[PDB]
Each structure stands twice: as structure tokens, then as C-alpha cells.
RNA sequence: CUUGAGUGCAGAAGAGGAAAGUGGAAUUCCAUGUGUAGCGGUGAAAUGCGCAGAGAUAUGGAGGAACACCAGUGGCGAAGGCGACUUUCUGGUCUGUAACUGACGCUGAUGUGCGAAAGCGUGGGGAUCAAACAGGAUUAGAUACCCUGGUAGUCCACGCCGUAAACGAUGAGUGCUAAGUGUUAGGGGGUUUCCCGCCCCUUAGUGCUGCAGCUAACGCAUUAAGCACUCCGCCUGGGGAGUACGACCGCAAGGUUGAAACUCAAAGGAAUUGACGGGGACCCGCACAAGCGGUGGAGCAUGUGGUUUAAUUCGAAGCAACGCGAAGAACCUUACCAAAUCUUGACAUCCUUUGACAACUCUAGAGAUAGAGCCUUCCCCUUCGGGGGACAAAGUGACAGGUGGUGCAUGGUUGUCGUCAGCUCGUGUCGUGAGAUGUUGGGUUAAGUCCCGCAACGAGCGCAACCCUUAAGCUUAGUUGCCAUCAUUAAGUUGGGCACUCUAAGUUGACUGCCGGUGACAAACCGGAGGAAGGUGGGGAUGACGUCAAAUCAUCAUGCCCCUUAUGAUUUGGGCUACACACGUGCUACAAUGGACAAUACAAAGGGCAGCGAAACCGCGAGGUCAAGCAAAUCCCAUAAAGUUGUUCUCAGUUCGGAUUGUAGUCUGCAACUCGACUACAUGAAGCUGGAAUCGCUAGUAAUCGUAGAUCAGCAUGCUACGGUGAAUACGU
């Protein structure tokens, strides 16, 4: 207890690793190599709003494939950006890359996308709850079996910490076959820090 | 009791006052295994004078607290609580037949 | 809830030796307990030499009670014993008095105790007595 | 005039009253007899009584009280109150009749009389009981509860007082307004061969349940708190206060009548939700119990407090701080202190000036660092320049940075009750309303587990389940693993075989599933068969809504405030560990179940790249030399201890004991003094099982003996993981 995102409890069974390469004891080099990429993507977060990326590392190459809802953005018209991204990356990775975007389907159903979404409408001076109303509204729309959506901090730019969540759709959480995509976000304007903890259930 | 003071330096004046008071409970019964005192300045910023006290008893114990303007008012107000929180207990009174 | 039986004694084909080595078996060390007990079956079967069961069975029918007591306001009731508890407590004061001779040997204190106890003497025949002086003294107000 | 009221006529019942008069039991006492040693009372005792003969037993006597069963949600009374019986006097009530009067009635200020218990007076009597009171006991204390006794009084008459929760918390009378069911005094009709049996109707009273109606709601509802009428009395926020002054009554006690000053913004009633109970009904739990083993007693360690200090850094503490943060304080770490120090700074980006970015020494310095010598020296592109990865020192102002503060400005993260069995909602109903329903009643499970019944129905989170490990088998595959047939080596060493064990992935398997019984047949539960495993096999993970303004600004981030030649940053040393002491936690001794010594058998897990360092060699050993092998089913680490076999010691403060201090050494580190561990020699402290009090544990458990791993230059009485050995108890709640 008290609670943990089930992903830690679900992984090793029902999902891939979030980053991958061959299994040798040079991990301090290679893990902290991966992280140098994981940082840089935040520049694209402001431009891409991707969910995540899992890297493979072929025997002398690297493969990453970015889970975005903004393909033509990141592809550009004819790849005017991806290639200087190869070289500005390869400049820092000290080793090459073969990026290949893996566009998001279904499409804007995901947790992370919606997570920073509502965080940003909130950051633009919004009564918080209605954002979650339209969120869940388009959520059951797109076809989903279980949701809730939580928020913390100094809501409405006012006095001491609070919380709220709107639960709808039956959400199997204490199960072990749920295959659900937990998320998190962080964004304030002037008063503290107001993250969120969205939940979903789609398939098993 | 670890008569510790958060953001207030326990003088001998304060120790004398405290222990002096609990001496009065030798009415019942002392029997002194231990006793503690938590005191703190928690800014509101009207800002306190918090008192939380703990009494371990025979086969049981009784915690006691309270807030007030200053330390001496907090020790006097928290008094007359950890007495009635203690009194009564027993007797209890015999049977069975049959 | 059952009491986790011991099968036979593998020494003379009794049983309660096994129940008894385990009561000498301190620290989980069996071999030293088994050692000193069977040694005591050498000593007591030597002195006034005889079978194991004469001194043993007799002595543990000289101390092995029939009535005990329990409390319940507080009124101590005399009670009939379940024979496992009977034998249990007999052996309890057996070893738990065996140390209490205050002597040197592994076995003399034992063989002194069971020899003495076959003769209706010592603190184990005693605790049978005093126990049965709590029984039938306390028949009145709790039976 | 009679239908109101009343008298009559005939009936009926009645603890209705006042005075008087008898009767019996029962207590207390007394006399007498019997007869010995306790009685009596208590939660447990004592106070008390008892050899002068108690109490008990028995006969008799005394006298005062109250009058058992009947007795009833029964009656009578205007109200208080009225219960042995009989007598004298007397009032009152209900029924039916009605011929008489002929509206004579209802209410009723003032006024007047009745009136519980307590009490006052004149007297009398005085058994029990018991204020006051005396005493014991209890209690931290007890004037009190409790026990022992005992006065007033309780009792009679006569007088007085004139109150009460004097309550149906409901003013008197008249009349209408659904039912049904009882009990009491009557009356009338029918039936019955005779009603005694029974049925029907009616009056009066009396209770119970319930429409309408009323009601704030509780609830009343033909004995209205309904519907209307007549008369009386009473209320105007609470407190102050039914109090003061005044007046009347009273022997007095006190009563009757009855204000304000000032004060408060509330006081209050009915009901709902939640909590609480020194309440109940039920259930589970090392909570009890039954056992075993420990702390607290000695020495050591560790954290904290407390002490100290130039500094002895910050926080964390009831369970849920105190072997925690910090899973390694000689420097580093370190936050703290001294000094030597710098300021766009330790370091980061931007703009400007350049550049491949500086190695080896010398001088001083304690280093930091400077003074220099010195070699960093446009490497990709360049058409002549430039662009550029990366640079120098300087300027550049933003800035940098803050272990400066605020965990009550926060996010994030986490303990907690609790792995308890509960926790909500959509729809609908109910109800003025909050709110309830579902989630309740019966069974049942470990559980909101299921089933039944039910203005409830459905859904959610939660439990189980799903997953990991473990117990059995089948298959798949055979090396570094195994040797079954073998031959063979010191040795599974070699040949060979994967058969066996082993080895990692999919199989089958346990699901009340099969049966028998019990059971509202259902839910289920008890039993039995097999099965490796029967009742969610064992454990692991997962910890609902939520409480603790729980914890953390010092993980990280961050709202706000503050600083900025310092509240920042650099260096050498100190310190974070001092000790009269205390708290917690652990470790080691207090011994023959044993200590000293010799020989010998058995594991699991896991580390290893320049790390694991095999053998050999040196040495009293710590260690030192050498070097085979090996990124591991291999080689090495690494050898298990307890134990088994013996010898001795033979109950000493001992060969217990193992702190203390010194001496001489090994490893690491530039450096073992404040402040590393270990080896050899000596020295041998306290301490004989720990007092009151107090802690854990239900089976491979406890208890005990070992092993490895991280944290790492060095370093764990700690933590994590692994195994070896290995019991007692569990009635019942």
C-alpha cells in the first residue's frame, strides 16, 4: 500500500519495456545514454504532444519510434526537420539513429495527451471541472470501459490544498488483467503546483 | 518523558513548572513509569502555544493535548483533562450466583 | 487444534521417552538430550537395578495428578484433567524439577528424581499433594 | 309544551366515609426448658452479639403495628385517596320506568370549604423501620454509597399548616362525526324441553387497535389533541426571579400576590445524520487463555535526549522516532567551526573578443592557488575571408546560487487504523423537511460470501478471483549438469548414455469436484472416497471511501518571502564520536544440558574482469610471495556451524567469564592521534539468570548455529537474502 500505479504491477506481464537494448552490465553508460534522449523530447512536447517513446538498440544502431498525434508536424512537409533531428541527436548521442514515427491511432483517446491537455486549459484560467466534463464526455464517446480523473493542489488559484475526481465507467484496478494506461501531469500558473492522475480502462 | 521543545528552548523554569504539576496526581497514583511533553510554536501567524502530553498508565495510557495563547495557559488548560481522562477506572463489583 | 503426535519411542519400544527427550531437547539439540536421558536409563536401571518401567511408570503414577484447578469474580474451580494434560504436566514438573535438585551430573538428578518419586517422595510427589490440597479445599465455592 | 333539568316508581353494585367492636398470623422482647460454640452480616471484612450460655429448638406471656392469598389495564371517589371482618349512622352513583312539575339550566370573578407525604403545638402510646446521629469498612480523600446499631418521627385523638411531577404534563358543560376488539353494573329480545349453558340489541363507565380530520412532529382519533357554540382562568424571548420591597395569612417554618436595575441574541420543542456509553445482542482477533522464550539485573554497541562546545550540523518521537533518515562521518562526505579566499562568482546560457581545448617541472604556498618557464596550438569545412564541434581570458547585464525560511502555500512520495469488511451512486418510492429505502429481516461464509424474504430495482469501488512462488505428474530437450548398464580415474577423470536426479517452458492436475448425510429441497454446512495436494493447499503481490492540518521545502520540483561582495562559492585542519547521567534497541557473560583440546559427517543461496586469486612457499596468525583457471551449471570465492567420536576439566567468581589497559605486529589509505579493523603476548572487570513491572510466538513456528550479498580504499553486535537443526502449548472465549 497505500497505492501504486498498476503499470508497475502490470509490467513484466502485459506490456513491453519502455526502453530496450541488449543485456550487458554497461548499464550506467547506456541507461544514462537513454536519458539524454528522454530529456530532449520535451522540446517536442511543446510542439508534438506525444504520449511516449520506447527505444530499441540494434547491434550497431538505434531505433526509436515516437507515439504522436501530430504526424505532419513532426514529419514536416517532406522531412525538413527529422534529419537535422537525426544529426542534432547524433551530435549528442555520439552515435547514429533511425527514427521512425509510430503515429497514434484511435486517436486522441490516450491518457498522457488528455492529461497535459486538461492541465493546459487549466493553465489558461479555466474553471477546472468542466474541462474534465468535456474530457469524460469525449472519452465514453470514443469507446472506453472505465475512467476516472483526479486533480490536486490549490484549485481556482485560491486557499489551501484540495482534490477532486469524477469517476465514471467501471474501472478494474485491483485486478491483474486490466491493461490500462496510467498517466500524470504537472502545470501551475501562479499558485503552487496542480498535477493530475488520470485513469482509463479499454481492453484486456 | 522527552520534554522537547520545537522552536522553543526548554528552560529549567519550564521543567520545574511541568513536573511540579504532575506531582499533584499522586492522588492517583504515581506509579511513575514515564511521561512525555510535546510543545511547539506553530505559526498561524497568530501562532500558538501548542501542548500535547502523553501519560503511560498501568495496563494502559492516556494522551492529552490542547492549544492556547501561551505555555502556562496551555499547561493549565490541558490540566483538568488528563485527570478526568483518568478518573474513574474500576470497581466493578462481584458476582456470580451461579 | 490436534496435538502433533510422536510415533513410537525407538528405544525399548515405549513412547513417552520421545515426549520426554523433546522436553530435554533445548536449543533444538536432540542428540545431547537423547544422550543424557538414555544415560539416565542406565543409571536408574543400575541403582537398585530393575526395568525402566518399574521406577518410571510407578514414579509417574506417584506424581501424575488427577485433579487440577483453573481461575474464573476470581473463583478457582477444581477440574478433571484431560489425560494428555495430566501426563503433560507430570513430565513438566519432572524435568522442571530435575534441574532444581542443584547438582552436577546429567543423570543422577534425573535418576534420583524418578527413584525418589517411585518411592512417593520429593517435590513432584509434593506438587501432586499440594495440587490435591488445592483440590477438595476448593471444591466448595467453584465446583 | 316536554325532548332539557329534577322529584317520583321499581331495580343494581360499590377497597365511599366517620365512630365502635372482635379475630389470626408475623416481628421484637421476656420467662422457662433443651443444648454447645459459634451467630450475624459483607464484593471481601470488621464494627456487634456469645461461657453471665448466645443463636437454634420448643411452650407460654407481653404489647404496638400493619391486615397475606382473593387483587383484575377491576371497582368507588369531585380531587387527594380508598383494600382483615362485623356492627351503627350516612352520602353518592348507574339502569329501566314514567304519571308529577313545567326551562326551574350551564359557567362562576369575588367568596367559601375539602386536600398526599413532610412538619409545629397540647397529650398519649411507642413493636418494626429509619433522617439526624455514634461506629466499622470502603476511598488518593468519603462528611456518602456499603455493614453495625439508634433518636426525632413513623402510630391514635385534637388542632394548625394549605404546598407537589396535586400527571391524562390535556379547564367545565352541550351536541354531531368510520370501524373492530375486549372488561365492569344493568336492562330488553331470541334461542334452550329450563340458557346455567349461548346468540342479538341497548345504556353507563372502562381499556386496546385503528379511517377521516387535525398535527411543527411526536401523535389523539366517540373517554378527540377532530368539528362548532357558551363561561372561567392563564401566556407574551430567556436570565435576573417566583426573587426584593410592600400587603394579607400563619405559633413558626414558610405561604399567597408579585416587580424592576442591568444583562444575553439567543433560550427552547419534535425529529434526522454522525459519534459516544462507566448500555445491551452477536461475531473475530497471541486480545484472552494454555505454553515457551525474553526486556528490565551485569559489560559492549548504536540512535536519541540531557550535558557540553569555537562546532559539537538539520529533521524525524505514543503504538506509527529512538540499529531512522544516513544501505558505510579519519580527509571526502559535512550541512558545522577555524583560518587562508573569490565575487556575472563554485558552476550554467545568452551578447562581445579569440581559440582546437594544456602536459613536465621550478619558486612559494598548508593547499587553494598563484609567479614563470612552458606547448594548449582552428583539427570538419574554406574559392584566399569565413562557417564551425570546442576554446582562452576578459567584458557584458540579465544572471548564477542559496543545505536561507515556510510539509499549515503545495505537488510528488509514504506510514497509520486495516488486509478490517465495508463504502457510494443512477432510477423510482417515502416523507413538509432534513433524511431513509437499496446497505434492512432468516440462514450461511474468513468477507456486503451466497441464497431466501422484502418499494425497491440496478450499477460502481472494495473481498475472492485474475498474476508470482511453492507441493505431484507428463512432455520438450542433455552441457559445464547426472552415472542407471558398463569399462575406467585419486577423483564422472576418460569413453560413452541422458536412463536417473537436475535443468527452463507448456502441459494435466484440486474446482465441494465425487459421493454420503444435515439443511426453507436452496444457500450452505458435517462426513467419506480417491488424489501429490479438499474446502479461497501454503505464502507473495495488491492496502476501498478515508482519518491523523501525520511526515518530507534536506529526493525532485515549486507558490510566497529573504539574501546577493554575501544567508552565496573555493582551500588546509578540526567536528558531526566529547560524558555526572538517563531512554530505547541489539549484542555478550553469568557454565557441567557445560568450558579446553584432538579426529570426522551434512546445505542453501550468491559474487567475480581484471575481479574471483587454486595449489605451492613464508610465518604464532593477521597477512606476504608466486602464479594455474575463470565473465561461469564449469574455475575460484569457500570451509559450513550446530553436530558425531573421544580426552580432560569436576562446580571455584572456576580453563566460567571476557570488558579493561599496555606491548609487538598485518592490511588499506598520501594520511589509522581527536576517529579503521584485525593478528601474537599479558592482564582478567562486573556478572551465578535478574526485583516490581513488561514483550513476542500456533509448526518447520519459536529457539538456536551457520552462510552469502549490498552499502566499500578501508570498515556491519546493523539490514536484506539463504539454509542447517529444531519442540512445548492451543480446553474453551
UniProtKB/Swiss-Prot annotation, chain A:
Entry superkingdom: Bacteria
SUPFAM superfamilies, per database record: Prokaryotic type KH domain (KH-domain type II), Ribosomal protein S3 C-terminal domain
Gene Ontology cellular component terms for the protein in this record: cytosolic small ribosomal subunit
Single annotated GO MF: mRNA binding
PROSITE patterns hit by this protein: KH_TYPE_2, RIBOSOMAL_S3
Domain KH type-2: 37-105
Keyword GTP-binding in record: no
Swiss-Prot/TrEMBL keywords: Ribonucleoprotein, Ribosomal protein, RNA-binding, rRNA-binding
One GO term (biological process): translation
Pfam families found in the cross-reference section: KH_2 (PF07650), Ribosomal_S3_C (PF00189)
Coiled coil feature spans: none
Keyword Membrane attached: no
Known partners and oligomeric status: Part of the 30S ribosomal subunit. Forms a tight complex with proteins S10 and S14.
Function statement: Binds the lower part of the 30S subunit head. Binds mRNA in the 70S ribosome, positioning it for translation.
Family according to the record: Belongs to the universal ribosomal protein uS3 family.
Cross-referenced PANTHER family: 30S/40S RIBOSOMAL PROTEIN S3 (PTHR11760), SMALL RIBOSOMAL SUBUNIT PROTEIN US3C (PTHR11760:SF19)
Name of protein: Small ribosomal subunit protein uS3
Annotated organism of origin: Staphylococcus aureus (strain NCTC 8325 / PS 47)
Protein encoded by which gene: rpsC
Curated annotation (Swiss-Prot), chain B:
Keywords: Cytoplasm, Translation regulation
One BP annotation, GO: negative regulation of translational elongation
Gene Ontology cellular-component annotations: cytosolic small ribosomal subunit
Keyword field contains Cytoplasm: yes
Main subcellular localisation: cytoplasm
Inducing or repressing factors: Expressed by 2 hours growth, increases to maximal concentration by 7 hours and remains high (stationary phase) (at protein level). More protein is found in cells growing under nutrient-deficient conditions.
MF terms in GO: ribosomal small subunit binding
Cystine pairs: none
Compartments where located: Cytoplasm
Family indicated by similarity: Belongs to the HPF/YfiA ribosome-associated protein family. Long HPF subfamily.
Self-association state and partner proteins as the record states: Interacts with 100S ribosomes during exponential growth, as 100S ribosomes decrease (after 7 hours) also found associated with 70S ribosomes.
Function according to Swiss-Prot or TrEMBL: Required for dimerization of active 70S ribosomes into 100S ribosomes; when added to monomeric 70S ribosomes stimulates formation of 100S dimeric ribosomes. Unlike E.coli, 100S ribosomes are present during exponential growth, peak during early stationary phase and then decrease (shown for strain NBRC 3060).
Protein name as annotated: Ribosome hibernation promotion factor
Gene from which the chain derives: hpf
From Swiss-Prot, chain C:
GO molecular-function terms, A-Z: mRNA binding; rRNA binding; structural constituent of ribosome; tRNA binding
Taxonomy, superkingdom: Bacteria
Keywords noted in UniProt: Ribonucleoprotein, Ribosomal protein, RNA-binding, rRNA-binding, tRNA-binding
PROSITE patterns, sorted: RIBOSOMAL_S7
Subunit structure: Part of the 30S ribosomal subunit. Contacts proteins S9 and S11.
UniProt function note: One of the primary rRNA binding proteins, it binds directly to 16S rRNA where it nucleates assembly of the head domain of the 30S subunit. Is located at the subunit interface close to the decoding center, probably blocks exit of the E-site tRNA.
Name this polypeptide is given: Small ribosomal subunit protein uS7
Organism of this sequence: Staphylococcus aureus (strain NCTC 8325 / PS 47)
Originating gene: rpsG
Amino acid at each position: 500500500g497505500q497505492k501504486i500505479n498498476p503499470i508497475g504491477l502490470r509490467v513484466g506481464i502485459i506490456r513491453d519495456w519502455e526502453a530496450k537494448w541488449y543485456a550487458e552490465k554497461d548499464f550506467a553508460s547506456l541507461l544514462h545514454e537513454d536519458l539524454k534522449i528522454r530529456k530532449f523530447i520535451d522540446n517536442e512536447l511543446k510542439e508534438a504532444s506525444v504520449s511516449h517513446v520506447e527505444i530499441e538498440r540494434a547491434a550497431n544502431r538505434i531505433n526509436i519510434a515516437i507515439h504522436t498525434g501530430k504526424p505532419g508536424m513532426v514529419i514536416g512537409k517532406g522531412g525538413s526537420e527529422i534529419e537535422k533531428l537525426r544529426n542534432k541527436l547524433n551530435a549528442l548521442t555520439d552515435k547514429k539513429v533511425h527514427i521512425n514515427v509510430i503515429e497514434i491511432k484511435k486517436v486522441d483517446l490516450d491518457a498522457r495527451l488528455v492529461a497535459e491537455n486538461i492541465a493546459r486549459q487549466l493553465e489558461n484560467r479555466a474553471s477546472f471541472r468542466r474541462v474534465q466534463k468535456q474530457a469524460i464526455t469525449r472519452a465514453m464517446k470514443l469507446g472506453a470501459k472505465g475512467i476516472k480523473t483526479q486533480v490536486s493542489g490549490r484549485l481556482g488559484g485560491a486557499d489551501i490544498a484540495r482534490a477532486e475526481q469524477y469517476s465514471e465507467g467501471t474501472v478494474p484496478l485491483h485486478t491483474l488483467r486490466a491493461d490500462i494506461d496510467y498517466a500524470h501531469a504537472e502545470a501551475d500558473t501562479t499558485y503552487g503546483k496542480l498535477g493530475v492522475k488520470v485513469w482509463i480502462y479499454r481492453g484486456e | 518523558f522527552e520534554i522537547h521543545g520545537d522552536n522553543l528552548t526548554i528552560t529549567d523554569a519550564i521543567r520545574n513548572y511541568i513536573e511540579e504539576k504532575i506531582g499533584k496526581l499522586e492522588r492517583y497514583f504515581n506509579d511513575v513509569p514515564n511521561a512525555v511533553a510535546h510543545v511547539k510554536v506553530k505559526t498561524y501567524s497568530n501562532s500558538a502555544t501548542k501542548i500535547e502530553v502523553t501519560i503511560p498508565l498501568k495496563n494502559v495510557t492516556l494522551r492529552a493535548e490542547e492549544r492556547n495563547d501561551d505555555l502556562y495557559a496551555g499547561i493549565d488548560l490541558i490540566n483538568n483533562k488528563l485527570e478526568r481522562q483518568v478518573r474513574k477506572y474500576k470497581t466493578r463489583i462481584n458476582r456470580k450466583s451461579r | 487444534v490436534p496435538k502433533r503426535d510422536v510415533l513410537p519411542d525407538p528405544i525399548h519400544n515405549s513412547k513417552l521417552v520421545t515426549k520426554l527427550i523433546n522436553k530435554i531437547m533445548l536449543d533444538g539439540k536432540r542428540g545431547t538430550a537423547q544422550r543424557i536421558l538414555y544415560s539416565a536409563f542406565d543409571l536408574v536401571e543400575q541403582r537398585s537395578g530393575r526395568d525402566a518401567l518399574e521406577v518410571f511408570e510407578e514414579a509417574i503414577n506417584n506424581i501424575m495428578p488427577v485433579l487440577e484447578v483453573k481461575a474464573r469474580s476470581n473463583y478457582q474451580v477444581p477440574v478433571e484433567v484431560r489425560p494428555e494434560r495430566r501426563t503433560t504436566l507430570g513430565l513438566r514438573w519432572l524435568v522442571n524439577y530435575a534441574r532444581l535438585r542443584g547438582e552436577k551430573t546429567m543423570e543422577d538428578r534425573l535418576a534420583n528424581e524418578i527413584l525418589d518419586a517411585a518411592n512417593n517422595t520429593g517435590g513432584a510427589v509434593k506438587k501432586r499433594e499440594d495440587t490435591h490440597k488445592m483440590a477438595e479445599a476448593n471444591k466448595a465455592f467453584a465446583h
